Amino acid sequence: QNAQALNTLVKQLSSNFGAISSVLNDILSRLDPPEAEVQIDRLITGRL
Amino acid sequence: AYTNSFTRGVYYPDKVFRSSVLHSTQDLFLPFFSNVTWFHAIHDNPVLPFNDGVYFASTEKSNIIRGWIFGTTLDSKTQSLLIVNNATNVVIKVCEFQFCNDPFLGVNCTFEYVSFKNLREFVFKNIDGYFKIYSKHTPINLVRDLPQGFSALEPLVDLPIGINITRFQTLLALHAAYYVGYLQPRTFLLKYNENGTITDAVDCALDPLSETKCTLKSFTVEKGIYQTSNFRVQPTESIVRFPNITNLCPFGEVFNATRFASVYAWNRKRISNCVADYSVLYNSASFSTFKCYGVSPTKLNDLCFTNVYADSFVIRGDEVRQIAPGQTGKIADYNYKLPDDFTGCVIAWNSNNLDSKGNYNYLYRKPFERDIYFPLQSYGFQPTNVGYQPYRVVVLSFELLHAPATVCGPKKSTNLVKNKCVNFNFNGLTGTGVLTESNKKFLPFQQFGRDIADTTDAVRDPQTLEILDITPCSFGGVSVITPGTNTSNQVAVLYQDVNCTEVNVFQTRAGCLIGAEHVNNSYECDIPIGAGICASYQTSQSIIAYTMSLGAENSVAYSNNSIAIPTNFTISVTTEILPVSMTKTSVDCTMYICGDSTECSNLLLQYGSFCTQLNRALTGIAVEQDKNTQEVFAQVKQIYKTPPIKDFGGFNFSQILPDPSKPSKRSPIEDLLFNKVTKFNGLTVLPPLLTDEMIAQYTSALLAGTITSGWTFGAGPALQIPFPMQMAYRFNGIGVTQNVLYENQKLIANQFNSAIGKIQDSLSSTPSALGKLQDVVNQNAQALNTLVKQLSSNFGAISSVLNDILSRLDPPEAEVQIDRLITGRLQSLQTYVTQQLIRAAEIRASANLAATKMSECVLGQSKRVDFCGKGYHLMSFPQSAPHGVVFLHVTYVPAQEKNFTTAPAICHDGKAHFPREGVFVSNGTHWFVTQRNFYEPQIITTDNTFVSGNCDVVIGIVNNTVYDPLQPELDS
Amino acid sequence: ECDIPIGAGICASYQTSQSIIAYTMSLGAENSVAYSNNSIAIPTNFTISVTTEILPVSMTKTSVDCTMYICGDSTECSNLLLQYGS
Amino acid sequence: NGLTVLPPLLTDEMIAQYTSALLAGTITSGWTFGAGPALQIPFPMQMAYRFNGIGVTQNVLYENQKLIANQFNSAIGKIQDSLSSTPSALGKLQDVVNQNAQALNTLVKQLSSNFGAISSVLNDILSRLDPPEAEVQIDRLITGRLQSLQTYVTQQLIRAAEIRASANLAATKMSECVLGQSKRVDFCGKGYHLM
Numbered sequence A: 001q002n003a004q005a006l007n008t009l010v011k012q013l014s015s016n017f018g019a020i021s022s023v024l025n026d027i028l029s030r031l032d033p034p035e036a037e038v039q040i041d042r043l044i045t046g047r048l
Numbered sequence B: 001a002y003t004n005s006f007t008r009g010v011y012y013p014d015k016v017f018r019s020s021v022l023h024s025t026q027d028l029f030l031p032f033f034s035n036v037t038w039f040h041a042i043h044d045n046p047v048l049p050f051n052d053g054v055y056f057a058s059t060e061k062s063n064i065i066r067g068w069i070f071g072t073t074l075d076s077k078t079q080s081l082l083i084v085n086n087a088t089n090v091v092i093k094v095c096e097f098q099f100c101n102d103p104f105l106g107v108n109c110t111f112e113y114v115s116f117k118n119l120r121e122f123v124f125k126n127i128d129g130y131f132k133i134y135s136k137h138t139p140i141n142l143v144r145d146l147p148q149g150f151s152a153l154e155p156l157v158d159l160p161i162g163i164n165i166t167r168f169q170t171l172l173a174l175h176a177a178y179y180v181g182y183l184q185p186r187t188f189l190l191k192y193n194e195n196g197t198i199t200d201a202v203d204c205a206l207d208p209l210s211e212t213k214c215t216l217k218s219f220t221v222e223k224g225i226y227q228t229s230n231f232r233v234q235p236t237e238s239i240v241r242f243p244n245i246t247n248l249c250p251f252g253e254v255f256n257a258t259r260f261a262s263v264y265a266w267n268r269k270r271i272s273n274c275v276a277d278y279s280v281l282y283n284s285a286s287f288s289t290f291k292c293y294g295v296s297p298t299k300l301n302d303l304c305f306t307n308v309y310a311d312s313f314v315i316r317g318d319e320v321r322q323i324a325p326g327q328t329g330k331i332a333d334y335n336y337k338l339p340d341d342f343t344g345c346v347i348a349w350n351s352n353n354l355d356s357k358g359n360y361n362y363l364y365r366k367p368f369e370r371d372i373y374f375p376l377q378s379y380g381f382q383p384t385n386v387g388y389q390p391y392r393v394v395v396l397s398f399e400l401l402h403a404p405a406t407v408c409g410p411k412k413s414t415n416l417v418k419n420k421c422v423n424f425n426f427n428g429l430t431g432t433g434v435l436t437e438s439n440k441k442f443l444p445f446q447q448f449g450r451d452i453a454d455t456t457d458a459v460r461d462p463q464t465l466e467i468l469d470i471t472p473c474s475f476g477g478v479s480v481i482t483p484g485t486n487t488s489n490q491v492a493v494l495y496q497d498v499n500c501t502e503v504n505v506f507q508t509r510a511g512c513l514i515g516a517e518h519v520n521n522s523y524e525c526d527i528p529i530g531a532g533i534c535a536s537y538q539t540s541q542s543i544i545a546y547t548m549s550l551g552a553e554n555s556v557a558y559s560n561n562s563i564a565i566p567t568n569f570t571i572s573v574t575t576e577i578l579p580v581s582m583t584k585t586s587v588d589c590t591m592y593i594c595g596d597s598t599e600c601s602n603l604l605l606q607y608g609s610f611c612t613q614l615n616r617a618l619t620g621i622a623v624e625q626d627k628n629t630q631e632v633f634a635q636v637k638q639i640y641k642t643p644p645i646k647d648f649g650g651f652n653f654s655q656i657l658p659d660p661s662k663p664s665k666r667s668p669i670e671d672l673l674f675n676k677v678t679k680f681n682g683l684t685v686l687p688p689l690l691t692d693e694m695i696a697q698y699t700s701a702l703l704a705g706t707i708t709s710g711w712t713f714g715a716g717p718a719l720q721i722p723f724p725m726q727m728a729y730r731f732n733g734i735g736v737t738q739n740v741l742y743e744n745q746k747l748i749a750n751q752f753n754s755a756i757g758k759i760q761d762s763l764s765s766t767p768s769a770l771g772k773l774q775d776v777v778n779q780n781a782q783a784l785n786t787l788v789k790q791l792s793s794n795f796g797a798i799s800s801v802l803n804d805i806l807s808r809l810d811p812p813e814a815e816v817q818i819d820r821l822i823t824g825r826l827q828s829l830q831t832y833v834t835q836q837l838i839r840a841a842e843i844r845a846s847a848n849l850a851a852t853k854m855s856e857c858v859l860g861q862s863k864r865v866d867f868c869g870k871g872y873h874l875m876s877f878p879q880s881a882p883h884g885v886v887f888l889h890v891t892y893v894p895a896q897e898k899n900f901t902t903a904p905a906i907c908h909d910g911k912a913h914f915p916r917e918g919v920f921v922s923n924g925t926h927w928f929v930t931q932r933n934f935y936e937p938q939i940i941t942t943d944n945t946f947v948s949g950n951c952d953v954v955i956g957i958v959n960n961t962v963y964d965p966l967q968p969e970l971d972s
Numbered sequence C: 001e002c003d004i005p006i007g008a009g010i011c012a013s014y015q016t017s018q019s020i021i022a023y024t025m026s027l028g029a030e031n032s033v034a035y036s037n038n039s040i041a042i043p044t045n046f047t048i049s050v051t052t053e054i055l056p057v058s059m060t061k062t063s064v065d066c067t068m069y070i071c072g073d074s075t076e077c078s079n080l081l082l083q084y085g086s
Numbered sequence D: 001n002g003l004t005v006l007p008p009l010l011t012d013e014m015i016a017q018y019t020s021a022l023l024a025g026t027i028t029s030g031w032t033f034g035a036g037p038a039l040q041i042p043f044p045m046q047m048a049y050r051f052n053g054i055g056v057t058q059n060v061l062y063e064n065q066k067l068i069a070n071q072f073n074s075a076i077g078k079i080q081d082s083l084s085s086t087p088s089a090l091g092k093l094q095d096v097v098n099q100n101a102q103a104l105n106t107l108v109k110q111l112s113s114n115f116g117a118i119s120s121v122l123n124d125i126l127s128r129l130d131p132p133e134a135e136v137q138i139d140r141l142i143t144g145r146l147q148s149l150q151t152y153v154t155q156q157l158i159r160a161a162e163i164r165a166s167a168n169l170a171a172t173k174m175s176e177c178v179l180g181q182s183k184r185v186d187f188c189g190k191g192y193h194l195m
């Protein structure tokens, strides 16, 4: 059960939560800050 | 004068059909028990205000009222609705009819239509010009005064008259008791019957009892104390204070400047120490656009700023879009960059007539740096160019940091009122509070103070340099103490944590108690209030308050040589009820969140395993409930059965054994307990693995095993043993010799049977006995009902209905509305599951306790004090119950006592004799030894005591003799 | 004896040539006691048995770095995260 | 800020009266008030029976009574000196008080966070933005503050369950140790329990 809980927590990084992309480096490399704060806030809320 | 008007003035707030439901809505309703004007139509036709809508009622006998007129001046200057009821043809016109000087009835129109015993009540309201008509027909028989009763008005007609109605008038026939009520924005609970007609209502602001009913969403309130609201004092007046400065801001030198600077070398002018009147700029029609990112366009009249800078330069029209955060181009990146957190607004308009004459004087090339084959390029602006024309753009940078302001608008100040709750406005900062003098020595440069929560603590008055503390206006809780509505409508009100100042007055440490009479005589408290005070309903009847009694006072007659030993006993039976299991719910993630919607399901797929991990948790709960039941009941390896002949030594168990004559072989007591305890959204209920018949078979096997084999089936194999010896050994196990059992066997059996009969009467007459199980069933039903009701919440979407959202917006907006609804519903599911996990853990702990008691109480005999009820434990018998188990505990309780003298030791020849068991007693002339828990005097002999040491050490030794049974055997 | 539970007293198992069967679960062999007021069963010899009881005592002492997890090596993400306090 | 504390129903004076009644009952009647009614019994015989309950013959008590009394009084003096000299004795209660104070202070401190809004102060939000933007800023702040309340409530429920378990253990020990005599090893302290 503990191994499964940790594996699920690690797997959760692959979820999008509505953003244009789940990968942070491609989010930062494509969008200007004025939209980046929104996309980052969405990912922060989901991960928190 | 007031009357008992009850619930008049209620109309259907909307056009939705509902039945068998209590609906809470906010709308314009008639206040309960309010004043309604009583008019006469004999031998009184004033013009009344309409406010935001008026309720109408009338009682007629000759059709006096035949048409309403609505308007403002009644003088042919505006359109006026004219309604005439002649024959059976309704005719409606809204032309500017010329009415007589005194309208009476004898015994530009935009919408034309042509077709006491009875009261016809109507509702006429105008919402955005739309005239909505409601009505209801019902017979009554009352002429003298206001009719008593309730009647709801349905809508029938909607006339598009388009008149703003603020006053109305009636028509009297001169040779009809009509009623006028007024609506207020009150919250009401409307009760719809089986036919969808509302028959009653509760006005949530009539009084504290109505507040309790409104809070608890029911028309019946149970006995107890409820916390329903909070008292808050309202402000009386506003205070507006600004610096008394009369200097005018030089806006003319900025907006009407002769020449603008180049974008590569733009000017930065400071405007300060002046009054900025923005009405001139607002009134000027010369501006083409006003788009602000800093402040809202309607707040500039009230708000004022610490500093203003005017950035003045000319750009190309097609580049106007480029002056914004996040935008790029030859301007945004190389010569004029704005910050992405810029606060203020960029305003631009064309200037073709003067700015362009071609004009080649405008040259172009981090935020706000002026970096003074060249990198320098220019535009050719020509007077014949809309977009390519030279736009004049001015960027106003506003500093909103909390600091002293110097440029504030043209608003006159008022006087300041101290020690009163007021609505203040200091340089655009608004709020409500009491402004008082303070002794906080702020430094001359400090303008604002802050609290731990970052709220404003104090301000410096811009006209007089003093510091005022802001203390929020007085507030506090209000508690209502009330008996149930099936008894009396009298209530008491407790004002929480306040003294009887700001608000038959009784001062307590809990607050100000109003309405209860203080009685000094004590009783046991019934409804607790707090701080040692409880209240009850007693006698002519009124609410009383008193200090709670802790019990009767009983001093102890302590002495060093007196012991009390019980002489008689009584057998009592108590009932212990414990929860064992809970309903095995299961939730379908897809149908619940995204019911029969492919698009919603496709969007849900992006969240992965978030729900199915709760599905896993719920599966674990469902499995562990059967594990708990299995562990609680399956303690016997075999199914035992009783003999056909119930020869149990005089003990009658026919009232606890299964009854063969029933369709299900249950005992009568079990029938009594079972006779006392009483969708399409993915919520289902799974059946239990073990049926009621199977549970009854296990309990029958356990009972037959206990009676026929004692503890032997628990310890090892089931070894049969007679019940009288089983009972004798259970008595021996508590330090009571079996001869008491044999002497009192008939009394014990009769007391047991009578106690069981008393259990039947108690279970048949006291409903609260099974509250521990009724509360769990009610909590689970309430949790499911709350989860189902939660679907009606909007969570910010344009509509709560998924089919209406999907049916109304294109994907680019529907996806946003759907993600919002998904987020809300996922939070609801997470909350539900977490609460279920905590409740399941509590139930599991209870089940473990029940199993421990079962094992250590029925199969054996417990020596742990108060483990199996008060008294000396003998045995327990299990009985099944819905979702639980009930234990019948048979205990030994001393009944009668006598005061006897005692002694620590007896001397014989100087030796000290001590008891092996029991105590020494004296009846006043002779010393005896008897068991501690039952008076049974025996002669003190050498076979009860032993010799150790001598008389010269022990304090309190008494002189006596010790009998040696051998002495007379050798003497005789 | 019940093997794969179905519900409402019905259990299933894989038995005999082999096929899936369904049946009412057994509660044990039936054995009535020849109860009378003058009969006792007393053991004459005994056997010593040993049973094993297993209980969990501890669990893995995990630790989670919220900053590295949420905003791994990203200054902008860290600066935005700083607004959420404790 | 809407955060209040309710008084307890039973005051300290009433609790002291209950403990006085329980101690007087124990001293004057042994276990008899627990089993049934409070029936007086002399202390030396009560002590002899307490000795019998642990497998120690009462004759040792009666022969050694003077020394036993002196050791008892000296031991009581030792409790007085221990409580007067060891501050850490009340850590189990100080930590719970500190945890509740910390929870309330963190809840109050949470008001300073923005959660993405332009400003944490609601009055400056309303005084600067028109309703069409105000609804967005306000619902965002409402969502954040509601989440903070939900976290507080969940932590409070778990701590309450732990306190309930501790209270049940304390009540069980009270019932099976003060009113009677415990034969359960190390249940009511190390050694052979007397009272």
Ligand SMILES: *[C@@H]1O[C@H](CO)[C@@H](O[C@@H]2O[C@H](CO)[C@@H](O)[C@H](O)[C@H]2NC(C)=O)[C@H](O)[C@H]1NC(C)=O
Binding pocket: B072, B164, B165, B166
């Ligand atoms: C609603 O009708 C009222 C009644 O005429 C209108 O208020 C009047 O407005 C005039 C014009 O300034 C004033 O001189 C009158 O004093 C007002 N009447 C009263 C009774 O105060 C009002 O403008 C209408 N409003 C709407 C939204 O239609």
Ligand SMILES: *[C@@H]1O[C@H](CO)[C@@H](O[C@@H]2O[C@H](CO)[C@@H](O)[C@H](O)[C@H]2NC(C)=O)[C@H](O)[C@H]1NC(C)=O
Binding pocket: B370, B371, B372
């Ligand atoms: C603004 O400050 C920057 C440094 O922060 C100055 O940059 C200098 O630019 C000149 C010419 O481009 C270089 O020779 C220097 O090496 C740069 N650095 C320093 C430290 O001088 C820039 O010149 C400043 N601009 C203005 C208008 O003041």
Ligand SMILES: *[C@@H]1O[C@H](CO)[C@@H](O[C@@H]2O[C@H](CO)[C@@H](O)[C@H](O)[C@H]2NC(C)=O)[C@H](O)[C@H]1NC(C)=O
Binding pocket: B568, B569, B570, B747
């Ligand atoms: C102990 O108390 C019980 C009642 O609680 C006594 O039983 C009654 O005794 C009286 C005395 O003769 C009779 O009149 C009644 O018929 C008895 N009642 C029942 C229900 O049997 C009992 O006698 C008392 N014991 C002693 C030794 O006095």
Ligand SMILES: *[C@@H]1O[C@H](CO)[C@@H](O[C@@H]2O[C@H](CO)[C@@H](O)[C@H](O)[C@H]2NC(C)=O)[C@H](O)[C@H]1NC(C)=O
Binding pocket: B652, B653, B654, B655
């Ligand atoms: C054992 O208890 C049962 C149940 O009370 C007794 O049966 C009751 O009394 C008469 C017997 O003359 C029956 O006809 C009634 O129908 C029974 N009452 C009820 C409510 O069913 C029975 O007599 C008792 N037997 C002994 C030996 O005490």
Ligand SMILES: *[C@@H]1O[C@H](CO)[C@@H](O[C@@H]2O[C@H](CO)[C@@H](O)[C@H](O)[C@H]2NC(C)=O)[C@H](O)[C@H]1NC(C)=O
Binding pocket: B923, B924, B925, B926
């Ligand atoms: C206390 O008990 C003693 C012993 O049971 C009683 O003394 C006996 O009294 C009876 C009177 O019926 C005589 O027959 C015996 O001779 C007495 N015993 C002895 C050893 O002499 C005594 O009476 C009881 N106390 C009271 C006050 O009655």
Ligand SMILES: *[C@@H]1O[C@H](CO)[C@@H](O[C@@H]2O[C@H](CO)[C@@H](O)[C@H](O)[C@H]2NC(C)=O)[C@H](O)[C@H]1NC(C)=O
Binding pocket: B910, B951, B952, B956, B957, B958, B959
């Ligand atoms: C028991 O017997 C005698 C008097 O009846 C007492 O015993 C003597 O007491 C005196 C006074 O303290 C001593 O000097 C002797 O040593 C004692 N002799 C013995 C043999 O013990 C005694 O006081 C009596 N007991 C009571 C309770 O009165």
Ligand SMILES: *[C@@H]1O[C@H](CO)[C@@H](O[C@@H]2O[C@H](CO)[C@@H](O)[C@H](O)[C@H]2NC(C)=O)[C@H](O)[C@H]1NC(C)=O
Binding pocket: C044, C045, C046
């Ligand atoms: C007690 O009963 C046990 C039952 O298991 C007996 O065990 C066996 O008894 C047979 C009878 O002769 C012997 O052949 C075996 O040697 C026994 N088993 C073992 C492991 O030794 C046991 O003998 C009985 N004891 C007595 C004293 O009768």
Ligand SMILES: *[C@@H]1O[C@H](CO)[C@@H](O)[C@H](O)[C@H]1NC(C)=O
Binding pocket: B001, B002, B035
């Ligand atoms: C209601 O009418 C009565 C008529 O006597 C009047 O005394 C009373 O003041 C009115 N109610 C209010 C709130 O003014």
Ligand SMILES: *[C@@H]1O[C@H](CO)[C@@H](O)[C@H](O)[C@H]1NC(C)=O
Binding pocket: B084, B085, B086, B087, B089, B090, B091
């Ligand atoms: C009543 O009779 C008059 C007679 O001319 C007629 O004009 C009028 O239309 C009638 N009233 C209605 C409401 O039709």
Ligand SMILES: *[C@@H]1O[C@H](CO)[C@@H](O)[C@H](O)[C@H]1NC(C)=O
Binding pocket: B078, B079, B096, B108
């Ligand atoms: C009718 O409305 C017109 C507007 O189209 C207005 O000019 C005229 O004065 C109105 N006449 C009456 C009688 O209301």
Ligand SMILES: *[C@@H]1O[C@H](CO)[C@@H](O)[C@H](O)[C@H]1NC(C)=O
Binding pocket: B193, B194, B195
């Ligand atoms: C509802 O309508 C049915 C129709 O027959 C009638 O029988 C019933 O009495 C009505 N209920 C009420 C409360 O009027």
Ligand SMILES: *[C@@H]1O[C@H](CO)[C@@H](O)[C@H](O)[C@H]1NC(C)=O
Binding pocket: B251, B252, B253, B254, B255, B256, B257, B280, B281
């Ligand atoms: C600009 O000039 C117009 C023309 O008379 C004048 O009405 C206006 O008040 C002036 N305003 C500013 C800000 O220059």
Ligand SMILES: *[C@@H]1O[C@H](CO)[C@@H](O)[C@H](O)[C@H]1NC(C)=O
Binding pocket: B243, B244, B462, B463, B464
């Ligand atoms: C007006 O402002 C001046 C500037 O300091 C100040 O002295 C004065 O008190 C203000 N007027 C009033 C009525 O407070």
Ligand SMILES: *[C@@H]1O[C@H](CO)[C@@H](O)[C@H](O)[C@H]1NC(C)=O
Binding pocket: B484, B486
């Ligand atoms: C209150 O009165 C109702 C009348 O229907 C009754 O059913 C209920 O049992 C009563 N409750 C109490 C506590 O008296």
Ligand SMILES: *[C@@H]1O[C@H](CO)[C@@H](O)[C@H](O)[C@H]1NC(C)=O
Binding pocket: B497, B498, B499, B500
């Ligand atoms: C009135 O109540 C307050 C608490 O609300 C208390 O502090 C104050 O001492 C009381 N006044 C008197 C005179 O006791």
Ligand SMILES: *[C@@H]1O[C@H](CO)[C@@H](O)[C@H](O)[C@H]1NC(C)=O
Binding pocket: B519, B520, B521
């Ligand atoms: C005690 O009871 C008497 C009864 O007359 C009453 O007058 C008195 O005020 C009471 N005292 C208190 C403190 O309640």
